[PDB]
């Protein structure tokens, strides 16, 4: 069995290997990359996402989200308070202000220590989930707006044509902006490209151990767990690496830098934080190996998780027994 300790693997494809996206994902899986839940892909030196980032300041962040924490430093939830619209140039200036800027630090490990010590005492503002793309249309390799769609994959594998679309999303971050513990909708893959700026630190639980994280989360968030049998779908709970280690939960960590891709694999729980002002692009995707995970994915039906239009068909076709209850949660 390849990668039996479920370590995060880092890949350096050549320009020739960067042509065929599906083939390279399958290659990484042949080497055991999925067992970690997360892999890093460093593009060949010949590749670029676009020519420059000098002209992005006028993108609008219609609904910036202030991430307010509750709990203790290592075990907390966050809620998202909506703020007034602002441009990317306005948000960059805000991120660099004395109130929000990255503190002085020695290295990524020092900054990580500072994040976990102090995150709860601040409320950073995240420009998340903005439909759009920063890949140039002429970038032919690993262009996250030109991937095979999940609807087409389901149709290819299972024969059923379904409605829905699959487009990327932009994320503008600042110091301490946080992504809570989650797997993807319908336990899909995700791919995330860090276009510019400061790093993003990731934590991940191997897919084979995801239920250990779920059991800990039910213990640590007992009111939330009574409210919903899949409350991590709400994307609000944080647990620190120190608490995971105290409770014996297997996990790994890695820092993504500008110019790097990360892939999350089906049922790979992940969480993390941004080091400072940055911009990432991410999208969900599927392969043949995903279908069995999609069929088994948990679902939130309490009403909180509320998701995209295109999840309806995935539930309807892959999980017909759960469909009626899930759709009630959507309405």
The annotation places the binding site for 2-oxoglutarate at: 126, 192, 200, 235
Phi, then psi, of 264 in degrees rounded to 5: -100, 140
Q: Give the shortest CB-285-to-Ni ion separation in angstroms.
A: 12
In angstroms and rounded to an integer, the radius of gyration of the C-alpha atoms of the chain is 19
Asked whether position 125 contacts ligand OGA by CB under 6 A, the answer is no
Considering the rule CB under 6 A, would residue 277 count as an interface residue with ligand OGA?
A: no
- The token pair at 261 is 């891709």
Single out the segment in contact with Ni ion by CB under 5 A; choices: 69-77, 119-127, 184-192, 196-204: 184-192
List the binding residues for Fe cation: 182, 184, 270
Could you say which of Ni ion, ligand OGA, Zn ion, none residue 209 binds, taking C-beta under 5 to 8 angstroms by partner kind?
none
Smaller CB separation from Ni ion, 94 or 204:
204
With CB under 5 to 8 Å by kind, the binding choice for 58 among Mg ion, Zn ion, ligand OGA, none is: Mg ion
DSSP 8-state class, residue 79: E
At closest approach, how far in Å is the CB of 282 from ligand OGA?
4
Out of 115, 135, 142, 179, the only residue in the binding site for ligand OGA (CB under 6 A) is 179
d(C-alpha 231, C-alpha 237), whole Å:
9
Closer residue to ligand OGA in complex, CB, 265/326: 265
Q: Which two tokens stand for residue 225?
A: 């767990």
Per CB under 5 A, which of residues 194..253 are in contact with Zn ion? Answer: 228
* Residue in 30, 39, 41 with CA at minimum distance from that of residue 8: 39
Per CB under 6 A, does 282 bind ligand OGA? yes
Nearer of residues 141 and 190 to Ni ion, judged by Cβ? 190
59 binds, among ligand OGA, Ni ion, Zn ion, none (CB under 5 to 8 A by kind): none
Contacts of 192 (CB under 8 A, 6+ apart): 200, 256, 261, 262, 263, 264, 280, 281, 282
Dist CA 219 CA 78 (whole Å): 18
Cα dist. 134→50, 52, 170, 194, 327 in Å?
Answer: 7, 10, 8, 11, 33
Query: Residue 21 binds which one of ligand OGA, Ni ion, Zn ion, none, with CB within 5 to 8 A depending on kind?
Result: none
Q: Which residue has the tokens 């390279």?
A: 24
How many beta carbons lie within 10 A of that of residue 321, not counting itself? 7
* Residue pair 60/38 in contact by the 8 Å Cβ criterion: no
3-state secondary structure of 121: helix
Q: Which of 190, 240, 252, 301 is the binder for ligand OGA (CB under 6 A)?
A: 190
- The item of Ni ion, Zn ion, ligand OGA, none sharing an interface with residue 302, based on CB under 5 to 8 Å by kind, is Zn ion
Detail the residues annotated as belonging to a binding site: 126, 182, 184, 192, 200, 228, 234-235, 270, 300, 302
Helices (H) and strands (E) in the chain — how many of each? 10, 16
CA torsion sign for 261, 38, 269, 322 is positive
Site for Mg ion in 50-69 (CB under 5 A): 56, 58-59
* 46 is a contact residue toward Mg ion (CB under 5 A): no
Residue closest to Ni ion when measured from CB atoms = 190
185 versus 214: smaller Cβ distance to ligand OGA = 185
Tokens of 321: 């027994």
């Amino acid at each position: 069995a390849q990668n039996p300790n479920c370590n995060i693997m880092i890949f350096h494809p050549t320009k020739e290997e960067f042509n065929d996206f599906d083939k390279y994902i399958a290659y990484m899986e042949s080497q055991g990359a999925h067992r970690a839940g997360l892999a890093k892909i460093i593009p060949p030196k010949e590749w670029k996402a676009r020519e420059t980032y000098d002209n992005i300041s006028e993108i609008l962040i219609a609904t910036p989200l202030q991430q307010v924490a509750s709990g203790r430093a290592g075990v907390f939830t966050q809620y998202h308070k909506k703020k007034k619209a602002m441009t990317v140039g306005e948000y960059r200036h805000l991120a660099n202000s004395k109130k929000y800027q990255t503190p002085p630090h020695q290295n990524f490990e020092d900054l990580e220590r500072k994040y976990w010590k102090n995150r709860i005492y601040n409320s950073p503002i995240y420009g998340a989930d903005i439909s759009g793309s920063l890949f140039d249309e002429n970038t032919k390799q690993w262009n996250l707006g030109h991937l095979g769609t999940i609807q087409d994959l389901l149709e290819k594998e299972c024969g059923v044509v379904i409605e829905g679309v699959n487009t990327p999303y932009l994320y503008f971050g600042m110091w301490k902006t946080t992504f809570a513990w989650h797997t993807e909708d319908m336990d899909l893959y995700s791919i995330n490209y860090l276009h510019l700026g400061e790093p993003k630190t990731w934590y991940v639980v191997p897919p084979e151990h995801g239920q250990r994280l779920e059991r800990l989360a039910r213990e640590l968030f007992p009111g939330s767990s009574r409210g919903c049998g899949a409350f991590l779908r709400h994307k609000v709970a944080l647990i620190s690496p120190t608490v995971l280690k105290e409770n014996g939960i297997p996990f790994n960590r890695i820092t993504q830098e500008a110019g790097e891709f990360m892939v999350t694999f089906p049922y790979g729980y992940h969480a993390g934080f941004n080091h400072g002002f940055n911009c990432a692009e991410a999208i969900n995707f599927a392969t043949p190996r995903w279908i069995d995970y999609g069929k088994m994915a948990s679902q939130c039906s309490c009403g909180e998780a509320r998701v995209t239009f295109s999840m309806d068909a995935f539930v309807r076709i892959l999980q017909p027994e759960r469909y009626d209850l899930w759709k009630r949660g959507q309405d």
